[PDB]
Amino acid sequence: VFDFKVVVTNPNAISEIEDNKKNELLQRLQEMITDTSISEDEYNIKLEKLN
């Protein structure tokens, strides 16, 4: 067999420095789809993808 998948070693262990980095990245995506969507035409389309 060959399934050398990258796994999380402790998947039930979420911390605060993990949550501040997810909160920073999710605020980074909102600056993108505000700029790349043209006046609410696809703004509710991309928001359903990152929901």
Partner 1 sequence: DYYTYEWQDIREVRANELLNHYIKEYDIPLIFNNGFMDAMTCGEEIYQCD
Partner 2 sequence: TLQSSHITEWLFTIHDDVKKRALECFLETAKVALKGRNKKFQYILSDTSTRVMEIDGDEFAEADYGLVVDNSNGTQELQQKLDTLAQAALQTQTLSFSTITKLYTSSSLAEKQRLIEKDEKQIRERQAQAQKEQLEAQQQIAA
Least distance in Å: CB of 48 to partner 2? 13
Taking the complex as a whole, the smallest distance from the CB of residue 40 to partner 2 amounts, in Å, to: 19
Tell me the C-alpha distance between 49 and 19, whole Å. 20
How many whole angstroms separate alpha carbon 24 and alpha carbon 17? 11
Per DSSP, the three-state class of 35 is: helix
* 2 is a site residue for partner 2 (CB under 8 A): yes
User: Based on CB atoms, which residue is closest to partner 1, 7 or 17?
Assistant: 7
Q: Which of positions 13-32 make contact with partner 1 (CB under 8 A)? A: 13
